[PDB]
Write a protein that holds these residues in place. Structure first.
Motif, PDB file in Angstrom:
ATOM      1  N   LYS A   1       0.855  -1.214   0.000  1.00 30.41           N
ATOM      2  CA  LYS A   1       0.000   0.000   0.000  1.00 30.41           C
ATOM      3  C   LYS A   1       0.880   1.249   0.000  1.00 30.41           C
ATOM      4  O   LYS A   1       0.470   2.298  -0.455  1.00 30.41           O
ATOM      5  CB  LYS A   1      -0.875   0.005   1.251  1.00 30.41           C
ATOM      6  CG  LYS A   1      -2.082  -0.910   1.030  1.00 30.41           C
ATOM      7  CD  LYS A   1      -3.235  -0.104   0.424  1.00 30.41           C
ATOM      8  CE  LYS A   1      -4.456  -1.014   0.273  1.00 30.41           C
ATOM      9  NZ  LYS A   1      -5.107  -0.800  -1.048  1.00 30.41           N
ATOM     10  N   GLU A   2       2.078   1.106   0.515  1.00 28.51           N
ATOM     11  CA  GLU A   2       3.007   2.282   0.558  1.00 28.51           C
ATOM     12  C   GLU A   2       4.421   1.867   0.128  1.00 28.51           C
ATOM     13  O   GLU A   2       4.935   0.860   0.573  1.00 28.51           O
ATOM     14  CB  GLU A   2       3.051   2.833   1.980  1.00 28.51           C
ATOM     15  CG  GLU A   2       4.280   3.732   2.132  1.00 28.51           C
ATOM     16  CD  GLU A   2       4.075   4.677   3.318  1.00 28.51           C
ATOM     17  OE1 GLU A   2       3.720   4.161   4.366  1.00 28.51           O
ATOM     18  OE2 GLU A   2       4.284   5.860   3.110  1.00 28.51           O
ATOM     19  N   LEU A   3       5.013   2.662  -0.730  1.00 33.31           N
ATOM     20  CA  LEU A   3       6.394   2.348  -1.207  1.00 33.31           C
ATOM     21  C   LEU A   3       7.395   3.347  -0.617  1.00 33.31           C
ATOM     22  O   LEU A   3       7.060   4.489  -0.369  1.00 33.31           O
ATOM     23  CB  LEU A   3       6.429   2.443  -2.733  1.00 33.31           C
ATOM     24  CG  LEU A   3       7.659   1.701  -3.258  1.00 33.31           C
ATOM     25  CD1 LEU A   3       7.279   0.251  -3.571  1.00 33.31           C
ATOM     26  CD2 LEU A   3       8.147   2.380  -4.538  1.00 33.31           C
ATOM     27  N   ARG A   4       8.603   2.896  -0.405  1.00 28.42           N
ATOM     28  CA  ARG A   4       9.635   3.809   0.170  1.00 28.42           C
ATOM     29  C   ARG A   4      11.008   3.510  -0.442  1.00 28.42           C
ATOM     30  O   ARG A   4      11.486   2.396  -0.374  1.00 28.42           O
ATOM     31  CB  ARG A   4       9.695   3.604   1.676  1.00 28.42           C
ATOM     32  CG  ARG A   4       8.822   4.652   2.369  1.00 28.42           C
ATOM     33  CD  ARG A   4       8.466   4.165   3.776  1.00 28.42           C
ATOM     34  NE  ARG A   4       9.718   4.024   4.571  1.00 28.42           N
ATOM     35  CZ  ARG A   4       9.687   4.243   5.857  1.00 28.42           C
ATOM     36  NH1 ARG A   4       8.710   3.736   6.559  1.00 28.42           N
ATOM     37  NH2 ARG A   4      10.633   4.961   6.398  1.00 28.42           N
ATOM     38  N   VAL A   5      11.606   4.518  -1.029  1.00 34.54           N
ATOM     39  CA  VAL A   5      12.954   4.326  -1.655  1.00 34.54           C
ATOM     40  C   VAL A   5      13.961   5.306  -1.047  1.00 34.54           C
ATOM     41  O   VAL A   5      13.759   6.504  -1.081  1.00 34.54           O
ATOM     42  CB  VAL A   5      12.848   4.577  -3.159  1.00 34.54           C
ATOM     43  CG1 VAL A   5      14.169   4.191  -3.828  1.00 34.54           C
ATOM     44  CG2 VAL A   5      11.722   3.717  -3.737  1.00 34.54           C
ATOM     45  N   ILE A   6      15.026   4.768  -0.505  1.00 28.69           N
ATOM     46  CA  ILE A   6      16.069   5.642   0.121  1.00 28.69           C
ATOM     47  C   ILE A   6      17.401   5.494  -0.624  1.00 28.69           C
ATOM     48  O   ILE A   6      17.970   4.422  -0.681  1.00 28.69           O
ATOM     49  CB  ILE A   6      16.246   5.226   1.584  1.00 28.69           C
ATOM     50  CG1 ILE A   6      14.979   5.608   2.364  1.00 28.69           C
ATOM     51  CG2 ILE A   6      17.455   5.956   2.180  1.00 28.69           C
ATOM     52  CD1 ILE A   6      15.034   5.006   3.774  1.00 28.69           C
ATOM     53  N   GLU A   7      17.865   6.579  -1.181  1.00 31.33           N
ATOM     54  CA  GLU A   7      19.155   6.532  -1.932  1.00 31.33           C
ATOM     55  C   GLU A   7      20.338   6.538  -0.955  1.00 31.33           C
ATOM     56  O   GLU A   7      20.180   6.839   0.210  1.00 31.33           O
ATOM     57  CB  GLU A   7      19.237   7.757  -2.846  1.00 31.33           C
ATOM     58  CG  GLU A   7      20.619   7.810  -3.502  1.00 31.33           C
ATOM     59  CD  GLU A   7      20.570   8.748  -4.710  1.00 31.33           C
ATOM     60  OE1 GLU A   7      19.537   9.374  -4.871  1.00 31.33           O
ATOM     61  OE2 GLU A   7      21.572   8.782  -5.406  1.00 31.33           O
ATOM     62  N   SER A   8      21.497   6.195  -1.459  1.00 32.00           N
ATOM     63  CA  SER A   8      22.712   6.176  -0.586  1.00 32.00           C
ATOM     64  C   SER A   8      22.716   7.389   0.351  1.00 32.00           C
ATOM     65  O   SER A   8      22.649   8.518  -0.095  1.00 32.00           O
ATOM     66  CB  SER A   8      23.958   6.220  -1.470  1.00 32.00           C
ATOM     67  OG  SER A   8      23.664   7.220  -2.435  1.00 32.00           O
TER      68      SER A   8
ATOM     69  N   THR B   1      21.766   1.938  -2.685  1.00 24.78           N
ATOM     70  CA  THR B   1      20.308   2.242  -2.812  1.00 24.78           C
ATOM     71  C   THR B   1      19.480   1.086  -2.239  1.00 24.78           C
ATOM     72  O   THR B   1      19.815  -0.067  -2.423  1.00 24.78           O
ATOM     73  CB  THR B   1      19.971   2.444  -4.291  1.00 24.78           C
ATOM     74  OG1 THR B   1      19.853   3.855  -4.443  1.00 24.78           O
ATOM     75  CG2 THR B   1      18.595   1.884  -4.656  1.00 24.78           C
TER      76      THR B   1
ATOM     77  N   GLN C   1      11.724  -5.834  -9.375  1.00 20.49           N
ATOM     78  CA  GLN C   1      11.507  -4.721 -10.332  1.00 20.49           C
ATOM     79  C   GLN C   1      10.115  -4.843 -10.955  1.00 20.49           C
ATOM     80  O   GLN C   1       9.575  -3.889 -11.466  1.00 20.49           O
ATOM     81  CB  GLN C   1      12.565  -4.804 -11.433  1.00 20.49           C
ATOM     82  CG  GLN C   1      12.693  -3.440 -12.110  1.00 20.49           C
ATOM     83  CD  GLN C   1      13.763  -3.514 -13.200  1.00 20.49           C
ATOM     84  OE1 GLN C   1      14.167  -4.582 -13.616  1.00 20.49           O
ATOM     85  NE2 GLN C   1      14.249  -2.406 -13.689  1.00 20.49           N
TER      86      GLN C   1
ATOM     87  N   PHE D   1       3.170  -1.705  -8.816  1.00 23.49           N
ATOM     88  CA  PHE D   1       2.665  -0.746  -7.793  1.00 23.49           C
ATOM     89  C   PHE D   1       2.624   0.669  -8.372  1.00 23.49           C
ATOM     90  O   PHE D   1       1.662   1.388  -8.191  1.00 23.49           O
ATOM     91  CB  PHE D   1       3.576  -0.758  -6.579  1.00 23.49           C
ATOM     92  CG  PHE D   1       3.075   0.288  -5.578  1.00 23.49           C
ATOM     93  CD1 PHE D   1       1.896   0.084  -4.881  1.00 23.49           C
ATOM     94  CD2 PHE D   1       3.789   1.454  -5.361  1.00 23.49           C
ATOM     95  CE1 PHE D   1       1.441   1.029  -3.982  1.00 23.49           C
ATOM     96  CE2 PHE D   1       3.333   2.397  -4.461  1.00 23.49           C
ATOM     97  CZ  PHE D   1       2.159   2.184  -3.773  1.00 23.49           C
TER      98      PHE D   1
ATOM     99  N   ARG E   1      -0.002   0.949 -10.915  1.00 19.55           N
ATOM    100  CA  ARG E   1      -1.345   0.851 -10.271  1.00 19.55           C
ATOM    101  C   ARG E   1      -1.677   2.153  -9.532  1.00 19.55           C
ATOM    102  O   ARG E   1      -2.775   2.663  -9.635  1.00 19.55           O
ATOM    103  CB  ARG E   1      -1.338  -0.311  -9.278  1.00 19.55           C
ATOM    104  CG  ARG E   1      -2.699  -0.382  -8.583  1.00 19.55           C
ATOM    105  CD  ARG E   1      -3.133  -1.847  -8.477  1.00 19.55           C
ATOM    106  NE  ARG E   1      -4.230  -1.953  -7.474  1.00 19.55           N
ATOM    107  CZ  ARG E   1      -5.067  -2.952  -7.544  1.00 19.55           C
ATOM    108  NH1 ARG E   1      -4.840  -3.909  -8.402  1.00 19.55           N
ATOM    109  NH2 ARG E   1      -6.104  -2.963  -6.750  1.00 19.55           N
ATOM    110  N   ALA E   2      -0.721   2.662  -8.805  1.00 22.11           N
ATOM    111  CA  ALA E   2      -0.966   3.929  -8.056  1.00 22.11           C
ATOM    112  C   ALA E   2      -1.097   5.100  -9.035  1.00 22.11           C
ATOM    113  O   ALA E   2      -1.692   6.112  -8.721  1.00 22.11           O
ATOM    114  CB  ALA E   2       0.203   4.185  -7.104  1.00 22.11           C
ATOM    115  N   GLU E   3      -0.537   4.937 -10.203  1.00 26.06           N
ATOM    116  CA  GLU E   3      -0.620   6.028 -11.215  1.00 26.06           C
ATOM    117  C   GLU E   3      -1.955   5.953 -11.961  1.00 26.06           C
ATOM    118  O   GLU E   3      -2.585   6.961 -12.215  1.00 26.06           O
ATOM    119  CB  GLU E   3       0.532   5.875 -12.210  1.00 26.06           C
ATOM    120  CG  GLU E   3       0.486   7.032 -13.213  1.00 26.06           C
ATOM    121  CD  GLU E   3       1.711   6.958 -14.127  1.00 26.06           C
ATOM    122  OE1 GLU E   3       2.762   7.367 -13.659  1.00 26.06           O
ATOM    123  OE2 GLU E   3       1.528   6.496 -15.242  1.00 26.06           O
TER     124      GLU E   3
ATOM    125  N   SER F   1      -4.614   4.724 -10.823  1.00 25.13           N
ATOM    126  CA  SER F   1      -5.709   5.010  -9.849  1.00 25.13           C
ATOM    127  C   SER F   1      -6.140   6.476  -9.953  1.00 25.13           C
ATOM    128  O   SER F   1      -6.815   6.908  -9.034  1.00 25.13           O
ATOM    129  CB  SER F   1      -5.205   4.724  -8.435  1.00 25.13           C
ATOM    130  OG  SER F   1      -6.328   4.161  -7.774  1.00 25.13           O
TER     131      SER F   1
END
Lengths: 71, 71
Positions: free
Chosen positions: B22-29, B36, B58, B64, B67-69, B71
């Motif tokens: 339901k929620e995505l989270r991406v943290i870069e270096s 990453t 991937q 996701f 799908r979130a786009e 929506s």
């Protein structure tokens, strides 16, 4: 179960560069939002909300993914 | 400034469906990670870490976004 507001009520009307973005956050329609909102976090320790309705948002955000992936 | 560990030390070795995401989270270096890491949150209120090194990651992650786009 009475009243719930979206995680993002406002957005940023000023295009910027992922250089200031260090963490990305995307929340799909939830029990509080019936849509999609792309949140983000700046290294300065701040958090704002972008509107996928803007083309510059799909770009600065796209670069973040291409940058965090190439890293 | 002594010792900092990455936000994600382990990953998930079991492919799944964005249906649980339901929620995505991406943290870069960051000052704690020199690479990453793609974090995610399940509706059940849980949080895990995926390895972009896996093709199924991937994909379930790509869905996701699509799908979130949509929506």
């Amino acid at each position: 179960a009475k009243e719930l507001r979206c995680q993002c009520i406002k957005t940023y009307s000023k295009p910027f560069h992922p250089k200031f973005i260090k963490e990305l956050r995307v929340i799909e329609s939830g029990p509080h939002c019936a849509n999609t909102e792309i949140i983000v976090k700046l290294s300065d320790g701040r958090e704002l909300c972008l509107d996928p309705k803007e083309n510059w948002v799909q770009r600065v955000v796209e670069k973040f993914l291409k940058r965090a992936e190439n890293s």
